[PDB]
């Protein structure tokens, strides 16, 4: 929620990936219960949404390769 830089956010994401690990319904309940509080999820979903946005507009300008010849 308060990720200052990219390196902390990436390691926190990898920690959450290692923490969930497929079939732990006991701790998905914890994420759902924590996210149903008053006026705090708006930054969490925004930092998840802009990272979607700033990445999908990267490949539209950078990765434009056309191997038109054999």
């Amino acid at each position: 929620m308060n990720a200052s830089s990219d390196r902390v956010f990436h390691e926190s994401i990898l920690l959450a990936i290692a923490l969930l690990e497929g079939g732990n319904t006991t701790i998905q309940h914890s994420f759902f219960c924590r996210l149903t509080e008053d006026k705090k999820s708006e930054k969490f979903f925004k930092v998840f949404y802009d990272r979607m946005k700033v990445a999908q507009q990267e490949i539209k300008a950078t990765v434009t390769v056309n191997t038109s010849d054999l």
Binding site: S4, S5, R7, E11, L15, A18, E21
Partner: peptide, 25 residues
């Protein structure tokens, strides 16, 4: 505060604590 390197070190320590297939016996 500044010096986030301690934070990434402790997160890496917790993550490598969580991993399987290493350090078992």
């Amino acid at each position: 505060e500044n010096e986030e390197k301690l934070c990434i070190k402790v997160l890496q320590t917790l993550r490598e604590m969580m991993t399987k297939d290493r350090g078992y016996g």
